[PDB]
Structure formats: structure tokens, C-alpha cells
Amino acid sequence: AGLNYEQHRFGMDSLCKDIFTYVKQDRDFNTGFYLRPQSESEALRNCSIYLASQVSENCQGSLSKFLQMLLVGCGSVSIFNQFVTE
Amino acid sequence: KIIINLFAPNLPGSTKEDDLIQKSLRDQLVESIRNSIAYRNVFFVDGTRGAGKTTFINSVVKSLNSVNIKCLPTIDPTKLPRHEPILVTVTARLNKMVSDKLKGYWASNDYRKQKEQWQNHLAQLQRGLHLLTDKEYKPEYFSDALKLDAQLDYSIGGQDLSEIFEELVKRACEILDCKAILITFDDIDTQFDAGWDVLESIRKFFNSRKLVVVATGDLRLYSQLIRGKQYENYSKTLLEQEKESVRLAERGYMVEHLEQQYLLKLFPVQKRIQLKTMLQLVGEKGKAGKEEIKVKTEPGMQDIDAIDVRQAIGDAVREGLNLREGSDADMYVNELLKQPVRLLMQVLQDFYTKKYHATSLSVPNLLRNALYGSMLSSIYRAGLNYEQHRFGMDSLCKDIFTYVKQDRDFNTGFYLRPQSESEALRNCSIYLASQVSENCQGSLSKFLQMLLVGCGSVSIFNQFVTELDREKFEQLISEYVAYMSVGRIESASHWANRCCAVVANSPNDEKIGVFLGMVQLNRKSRQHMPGGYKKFNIDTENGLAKAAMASSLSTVASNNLMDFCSVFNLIGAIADISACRCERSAITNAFNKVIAQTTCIVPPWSEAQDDATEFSDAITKVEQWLKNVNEIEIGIRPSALLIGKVWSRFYFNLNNVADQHKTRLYRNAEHGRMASQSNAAKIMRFNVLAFLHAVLVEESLYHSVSDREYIGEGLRLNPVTSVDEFEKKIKIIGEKLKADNKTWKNTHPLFFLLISCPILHPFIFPVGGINCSVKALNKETSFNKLIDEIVGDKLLSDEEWDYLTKNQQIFQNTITSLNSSTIVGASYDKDTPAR
Amino acid sequence: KIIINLFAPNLPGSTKEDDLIQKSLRDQLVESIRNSIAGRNVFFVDGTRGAGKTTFINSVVKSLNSDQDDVKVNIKCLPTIDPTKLPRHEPILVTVTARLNKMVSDKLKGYWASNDYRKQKEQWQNHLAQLQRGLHLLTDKEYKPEYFSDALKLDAQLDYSIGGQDLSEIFEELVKRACEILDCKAILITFDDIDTQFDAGWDVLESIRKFFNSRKLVVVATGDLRLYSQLIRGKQYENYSKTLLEQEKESVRLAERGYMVEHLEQQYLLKLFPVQKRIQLKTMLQLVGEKGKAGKEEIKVKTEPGMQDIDAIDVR
Amino acid sequence: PEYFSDALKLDAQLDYSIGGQDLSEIFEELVKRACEILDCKAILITFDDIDTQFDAGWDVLESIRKFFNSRKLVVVATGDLRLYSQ
Amino acid sequence: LARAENDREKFEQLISEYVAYMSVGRIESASHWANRCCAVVANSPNDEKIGVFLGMVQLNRKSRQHMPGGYKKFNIDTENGLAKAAMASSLSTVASNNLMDFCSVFNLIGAIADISACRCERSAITNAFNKVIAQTTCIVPPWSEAAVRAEMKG
RNA sequence: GUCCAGCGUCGCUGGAC
């Protein structure tokens, strides 16, 4: 699928890039950031579960990491769809 | 009598005399062969692919081997080596036949002379066989060519392989003591590149009167074989140069004349035999068939009990597709009979084998498995889905769209009739119809999804999108499929919200806010409203009216937020609620699933009172309703046609309502009593009557559990403005069911469940949308009484019903604010005409 | 009941344990073969979604090695690893003789010398040498006149009904002789995937319908039909006259030729792999069923080392 | 065709799993003998990139998927996937 | 509807529809053919929109708003014995956007064609006569623009 | 004839009386 696949070097830096490089291939800017397994490609359906698990691990037990996911991870996708895409 | 056993090998090598389908033709051909030798002498058994040609020939050969003719072993040029001349193989078969005869003579006083006569003839053929092998002319054989033969004294000099083989057969016949020899060629269907060598050998070598040939194959293939070989006699330099239209037109004619003349000289037309198909043998419908055919569906079935081949497919189709007996069901079985017998036999041999194993059910599951395997090739060429494990509601809703697109008939292509002229699109309709009747059987939530998603997407696109040419067509097609996201939807309610955006963008005349089933209310207050007209607000409604009105709200964001009141949303909520009964909180998550949790953008192609237990009663009624649904819906048998017809009526009904109300708003439409004045409550009232009306008529006529229609004679219309058309039919149905000792639940399960739905009841009787006149109340009161009887509980009390008809109370079951709402683009300046 | 122990003693990969997952399907298919053997016996096992089709087939092969009607089974032959110019007729023939040769060499242990031992071995060598001579007419490109003498040459033994070489019959006698020697009822052949080498399928499809049509032979082929359909359709255009293709291309004959080629392939697939014989592998969802429904057989999973089977929890 | 009689001269040596003149099984026993003689657990085969002339890379791939599949052989290939895919 | 020289597949397809619709080659009944012929010729009105046609004339089922003199609707019940029998053998109805009535002369020829092939006794004459005079409806042709509405209302 | 109602783009058609 083209996402990050290094065994280490996991953090806030790569997760936001992975989310935006997944919706771009899924062509779903409306509700694509829920990371749901509804897709026509077996590669993409396998990536949806992996991505969802990574989110719950990173922003667990902290407040700032949660707020970063709300803004950077999901805000960028929704902002792009309404304004830039036109 | 002909009886076919399904639990048998059913192969050309394991068929007996009582199993053949063309027994009449076999006797006709055998007599003709005997007559020809008793008084170009070649036959041709015409038959399309998979019509059972080898099986027929084997019967002909075996019957003649039971006026004395010796039959050679059957020869098919496909299995032969790619470079072996036919004359080599045929003379090899003769060698085995005569040698076995000579050995039986044991010691022979005078037949030893015959043996050396045979050996010399075979050696003579061997010397001259190099003519068919040489790639270059070799002149040192010329002295050998000028060798006079002292025996049989050939009139014509030279090798002349034609005259040598004519002698060879003549000596063979006397050894075997017969008067004819039969050479049987099988089909060249698989590899017709090597069928040319057979044709040349027949034309140039088998010309004697002691040889009779029975060819086998289909003529259309032979036409393309010969016509292709007639183009290679031209000089390529000539075809390369004279490439103008006039010369090409004349040259093509010449090849056709030479090609046709070739077949007449090879296979005379008076000898041709055409293999009848299955439809011709059993006739059409009740017409007396020329022959009767019976099968054995269960193992061990005796000969005395056996069902007709028309009935054998008749019950399978009428049960697998959940389609009622009639002309519509007879259209499918007539088509299945036209398929080649190999394909037809494989479908039957799979369905009845699996079904008996299950019995040792879900019959439609058995039919879909059989058709998918048999008609797999047509699936691939049509571009349909072919993933077995991905079968479900989502895949089926996309296959319908990708089929009608190739059918180029958006108006009525979702009926899945087998009417397309393309063979692939005719083998896919029977397959798809088996898909709908399987996934949709036994559930109401799945049924409503098909009626909305499966057929709604097709009709909406054809009216509001295609009016916007090859490059643009798939451009809109690609844009529309992804934007509304068919095949990956999340819920019917979310789909309906996306449906609001598509309809709204396209402008209409007078710019009135009324649309196809949706009313565009107002968000910003406008000054100087006559009467009590004011902005719509959701706070006024208290109980079930507040919940029901909430289920019919959708917001679209395009330079300005817009509010509609769509009937499509109600179908979504009903489809969403009845999904499961596992949890109680599910039936309150559906009310507020989309109301204020998401926003929809304009499509790209556009040109530009404790306040905590308020829902304690509405949830309670809905919870009790799900008890009835979970029991009645088990006996539901929807069809691929029933869903198609209900949408056709429902779609037509909505389009009429939206046109006969754009001009009936005026200034004093509030408290609308006269039929000439309408408000936002009447418009939304008929949009839910129309949905209920279409279910009533079409379910009665086409649904499987009802054996005979109950509507009766007379025209069937729709309630565009009045209500008496809808109440008229219920009264007729009420009497007929009562007189026949029957109940609604056992004949109209789809209508009974929908009419007794807590969500729709507030919309049926809005406050401001009830006709009032001297004659109207006769229809309304009778209609109100009839509905309360079907459900079993009266919806409205005496004081409630009195206030609706006649000129303050806490209405827990009716909308009180819609009639006073203001619709955008409706500039109230006119007045109601008086008459 | 089905129990899977995650804490297997050796901690193997994939935790196969016992009974696998398709024990119901495996016994069903094996029962189906025995019925037929007691013309066309082609079984198609569809391995897709990256399934372990080879693992399932080998389970069938191993199961048939302990059989009441003891229909012995050959070894799997992948068409993508054989030499390119070696016909697919040879691997079965080599596999048959190798399997047969061990048994007759093992007859020495049972019987140091016997009448059947001396006669069967020399009879078998006669059949093979018979096939080698006729093997010349497979890869040859031009019919030399010398082979005519052999075709007219007659053998009083081996009971060759149809005259000529007729390589189909020569193989049939060899198979019939082998079954009697090994004391079996049928010889089973398995064909693996063709995914790695696309074109290897055609030389197998034309070998099933030419030499493997017999009463005492059963085959089990795997793969997917998307490649097979494209393989058959490709070979149905190569017999059209090359000149005709550039001449009659007036946009009407293109439709006629396209409609006819799709007809020939459809009748081709139904001839080799019948619908009634095609088998499909159940998935986990279809085997445990949807939640709230009993569905098919239930499955239990262990979660801790030394966990009693009385407490194993459902897989869902 | 004359090699048909050359084969079928079956030998019990090495107890081959399958009959025939397959090179893969013969090469495998060749490696096993060499490992015993050299007293090494396994043999490592190292290839090199094919950037200069990538037509020769096909013969490498065929000889890896057919003849190098034992547990005594480790293969280390070098190249560029963007070139191997073409 | 479909030009002969502009297109061939469209014209050839239109032939197939006409062969099936008129039931040519099946010949269920001569009267059946006559009823179908009414639908074909009533599809295309003339410029003046008069109710007269090739061989038929379009009668009125519902009386119009007002009448000048003695003009009125049909009221078939007025006719006496033999005249009613001839009348009913000529009346026909077509299932279209709205129900329509005709008085086609081809129906009269159809009636003669059905009776004249009897070769029976008096008992079968009474039945065959009764079968000729009845009410028969025929749907509009597929190529018409009112097919979908007629299928629903009818 | 009257009244309600339904199709078509005033015409046509259905029901009650």
C-alpha cells in the first residue's frame, strides 16, 4: 500500500503521514479518517486494521498526543477536502 | 418414451437407446443412408455448439452395426497428429478390418490369392504417398510416374491417387462381402485449423460409389473457414495496392460467390440434417409437443413417476427465484430451454443433486450456486463481480448498476428481464435475478435497502445527471459512482442524505423549493409573511412527532446550509432501525444517526417534561413493533421483479405529486381544507401515502406467498391529490380476504408491517393536511376506520380526531408545525381561486 | 467438536494441530470420488484469496493412501517447474513407472521367484517400448513417409482395436495393465497451479482431454479460471486465417468473430471442468456462522498453557 | 525422443522422492555431499546487480526459483526493484 | 421511425419488434390481428387531430362537456338483435394512456374469417358466434411512447 | 346532466348519483 513499514521509528511524525497517504489512495476525503475496513482492495482492507491499532497505541495515557491526533491527523484531511480540492 | 436420469454419468459414452433426445432423427437418417446405397453421396448433420453431435453420431453408427454396410471406427481430426494426412489414417482403419477377417478364414485354398492382392494394393499406395509429403517438386520420380500397370489397367496414367484408392476400396468390399463403406468424421469445433485437410480429402479422394461419408459440425464455422481460405488465392501485392472502396466492395462479393459454390458442391443441400434444439422438441407452453421428455429428480424414482422437462425447470425457476406462476415466470423457462443441451443438462444435474443432498434448505441459495458456475463465462465478459467470499448486499447493489449501464436502458433496465439481444447480457439477467431472491429473502431491512439503493441510484442518475460525448459519459459515470459511494455505503440514511445534494443542484422552472419527494424549508426568517407563516422550528413537536420529524431532516452545505424534508430519509430510518434487536440503545441511535453529526458537500459536477425520558414512549412502541417484525418477516419471499415494480410505481407517483403542488401554495394555504390549496404538510403527506400505496398494489399482484391476486378488475391509479384511490382498494381487499377466511398477515406481509409502523403514523395524518368538505370526510373517516382495523389499535382518540377535521392539546402522535412552515422560492402573493 | 491448542508443545507456525479446518469438506470430496469410480472425472478445487490449496490437496492424497477401494495416488506435478520442451505426458508416465517399479522390486521380499513376477515384469517392459516408438508423433513438425509402414504394421497381441498408432489407446492399455499389477481401482493425478508460468496451462488442458479420458483415471486440478479463460480464448484466435483478419475488418465482422470466440470458450470450460464437480473451500466466517446463528460446526480456541478443554472459548 | 529410454533407468541411490531426470533433486544431493566434505552448516551464494545489462537478470531469477530451495543454501541478491519489476 | 438508409441495425431491430408484436407466423386468430392493427395506426395522429383514421373511426366513451344537437355517446345497448351482434363484432378497445374505442373495418373481416372456417354443426355455431362478439383489449406497440404508462394503468 | 377524481399537452378517462 505504500505506508510506513519500518520495524522501529514509530511516533507522531509518521502516523499523520500514513493516515493522509491512506485516504489519498482510498479516494475518500469525507469519512475516510475513521479507518474502516470497507474497501475493494485486500491490501487496503488489511491496512485499515493495522492503522487503527497504531492510533490507539500512540495517543494512550496522554492528553497532548490526543489533541495532536484531532488536529493534525483528522483536521488536515477535512480541511483539504472542502477548500483545497475545489 | 424418453426418460433422462440425472444421477447418471450422462455422457456420450454412457447413453442407451432409451436415453436419446433425438431418437426420431436417428431413425430418419439411418433409413436414408440405406436407401442411397439401395438405388455426391455425402451427408452433413448440422448442429450448433453443445447440441450433442458426437452422441447422435455414435447412435447412428451403433444402430447400423447391430443393405449390408461395414462401419469404420469413428474418426475426429482434432485428436489426430497435427501433420498426418487423412488418407493415411483412413487406410489404416481398413487394414485392421480386413486383416481380422482374413485370419478368421484360417487355412484358405483360394483366399491366399486375395491376401497378396491386398498386400500389393497397400504397397502401391505407399510408393505414391510422397505426393502429399513433398515440399518441393522432385523430378526423378517422373520416370517412375510413366510406369504402366499390368493389373487393373488404369485408364489414366500417372500416380492419380484418386483412382488408386477407388481400386483399393473395391477390393476391400469383396473381401468383407458388403456393398458400402461408411466413414464418419466428427466435429472440428475445437481446432478448425486442421478441418481444411479433411475437406480437401473428402473432395479429392472419396468420390467412389462404395463410400458414404457422414460429416459433423456447424455450418457457420465452416463459412469462416472457407471464406478465409479464398482470400489467400489473391496476390498480396494486389490487395495491398487496389485498397479503394469500389474495388474492395466488388472483390468481397467474388469471394462470397466462390465460397458458397464450394459448399453446394461439397455438401448437397437435399442431404443436410439440422439438429433440433430442446425448445423445438417440447413445443411452446401448452402446444402439443412433437416428443415428450421426462426426468428423474430424486434417486431411485420409478418410471411411472417422472415430471416433464418443462415442469422440471418450471418448479426450479418458480421456487429458486421466488417468482409466482404466470407469464413472467414462463419467460425465464422458455429462455433456459434455448441454451445448448450440454449447458442445460449441467444446470439441472447440479441443482437437483445438491438439493437432494440437503434433504438427505434455502432453495434460492441452491439456484445461485448452479447458475454462477454454469454462466461464469458470461460474467467475466460482462464485467460483473466474481469474488465468491465478497457476496452480500453491497456487491449486489453495484452489479445492478454495472449491468444496466451495459444494457443502455435506464428507464426499465432494473427489472432484470431476459430481453437483451446480446447473449452475455441475457445469461446475466437470470444469474442476477437469482442473486436478489437469495440475499433479500427472509428480511425486511435488506428488502428496503434494495428498493432504495439498488433501484434508486439508477433512476436518479438517468434524470438529474445525464442531461449534462463518449469522454463525458464515463466521466460522469466515474464521478457519480464514487461520489454517492455505491457499493461501500454505511447506511441507508447516509445514502439518502447524499441523494438530497444530487437533486437540489439542478435548477427547475420558477425556482420553487418543492422537489422530487423533498421540501426545501427555510433557515433565515423573511419579513412580511401573510397569515401565520413562520420559520420551521423543531421545538414545537413533543413526542413521536419530534422523533419522526427528526428522521426527515438533511443538511447540505453549498455556499449556504440548506434544509430539506426528504421521504427518502424515512425509508432509511426504517431500514436502519429494523437491522437488529440485540440492544435497546440501537433504536435511539438511529433517530440521531445523521441529524447533527455530519455534513455533505455539493457534488463536483454542479455548475456552481424531564428532557431525559422524552423518548420513553416512542422507544417503547418501536420496541414492541420489532417483536412483530421478527416473526412476520420470516415468511417473506421477495423477487427481482417485485422490487422492480414497486419502484416504478413509487417513482412515477412522486414525480406527479411534485408537479401538481408547485402552484397550489398561494397565501392562505394554512389550514388547507380545499383540494385546490396545499402547504408543506399536504406535500409531505402524499409522499408517504405514495410509498405505502405502491407497496399495496404491487405486492398483491407479484409477491410469492399469495397464490392469486386480490385487487380484482378495474384500473389501478395513484393518489396524487385525493385519498380515495388508496382507501378504495383496501375496502375491496378487506371484503375478499374476509369472505375467503384469510388474514392480512398471511397475504400482505410487506404492507401489513409497513402500515403498522410507529414512525410513519404521524405523517399519515398531519394537522394541516386533511381534506375537509361535504364529501371528503366520507372518504377520510372510512379511511381512518379502515387503518385502525388493520393495525388493531386506533391511532387517534375521539377528541383528537374531532380537532383535526373540525375547526389546545399536547399532540404526542401528530406533527403540528409543518403546515405553517415556509418554503423557499414560494413568494406568497396570490390567493386561492373560488369555485 | 473442534479444539485448537495455541500452546502446542513445539510452538509450530500457524498452529495446525489436528483436524485442520476442512475435515468435513475433505471427507465429503473423498466420498465423492469413490462413488464415481465404482468418462469425465475432472475435479476442480478453487484455491483463491491466497488459500492453502496445496495443503488441502495433500491431505486428500494422504487420506486416499488408506482406502477401502485403495485407489492409489501419484505425486503432485507442478507444471511450472518441468522442462519447457518436455510434454506433460511424460511426467505421469515416469511417475507411473517409478511407482510401479518399486512394487515389483518389492515383490522379491514376498516372493524371491514366482510365475507372475517373471511374466509381469517382462510384460510391462513391452508396453513401455511400444509407447516410445509412437512417442515420435508428438513434437515432430513434418510427416515423413517412413512412419506409414509402422501404421500399417500390425501386432497380433495387446488387442489394439482401432488401427494405426493412435497414441490415446497405447496409453490406455498401459494404465489398465498398471492398475491390475498394483491391485488398485484407479490412478489419481493432481495438477498444481500455473500462476508463475502463465502459458503452462495450455499444454495441460490439451493433455487432459486427449490422453486422460478413461474409466480408470481420475484427476484433481487447482487454480483459478480467470487465467484458464484467457488461455482458451487466446488459442481460439490463432486458427483464423491471418490474411482474412486484415481484409474483413469492416467493424461488423469484428462483432461476429468476437461473439463466436466467446461461444467456443464457453463450451470448452463446461466440457473439461463440469459445474457439478467444481468444489469450493469454505471460509472461517461461513464455518462458524454469523453471531447469534448456530450456522455450521462450532470451533473452540485455547488461550492459556495447560487450559482445560472444558473451558475453551469460542473462536468468535 | 531417444532420451526416453535413457531415463527410466531407476536407481535406489539417494532414494529420490520423485522419478525422472529433474535437475533440482540431483543438484540438491550434490550440495549435501559438499557440505559434509567441507564441514560447514550451509553454503552462501552471493549475486550482484544487473544495472548495466538487465536482460541477464531473468536467468538468475529462474535459477533461484527452481534449483535453490534447500535449507543448506543462503542467497544474497543485489539490484533495484524498480528495474526487476519491468 | 427508423430510416432505411441512415442505419441498418436500428431498422433491422425494428423489424423484429413488428414480427413479434403482430404475431405474424403464429396466427392465433384473424380477429387478434385486426385488434393489433388498430394500435399501430392510432399511434401517429394526423395534423388536424381528427378521430378518423385509415380504416377506422375513434368513438367516444365519455360524453363531452356539451353537445350542439342530438349528438351523444354511443350507448351500445340501444341496438336491437342482429344490429348489436354486428356492432359488437366491430367494436374494439386499445389500452393506452387512456382507454380508447374504435370501429375498425378490419374487425369485420376478422369476424368473417373466424366463422367461415367452422365446418361444424349448429351447436358449435352458437359457441363460435359467441366467441367472435366479446370485449378484447390490446396493448400499445413497444415502440410507442405510452407503453410504460399503459402497462401500469391497465 | 351534476359532483368528486385521475392521464396527457384544453383534450381524454374512471367512480358515485
Ligand SMILES: Nc1ncnc2c1ncn2[C@@H]1O[C@H](COP(=O)(O)OP(=O)(O)OP(=O)(O)O)[C@@H](O)[C@H]1O
Ligand atoms: N442423447 C443424449 N442423452 C443424454 N444426454 C445427452 C444426449 N445428447 C447430449 N446430451 C448432453 O449434452 C452433452 C453434449 O455432449 P456431446 O459431446 O455429445 O456434444 P458436442 O458439443 O457435439 O461435442 P463433441 O465435441 O464431443 O462432438 C452431453 O455431455 C450430455 O450432457
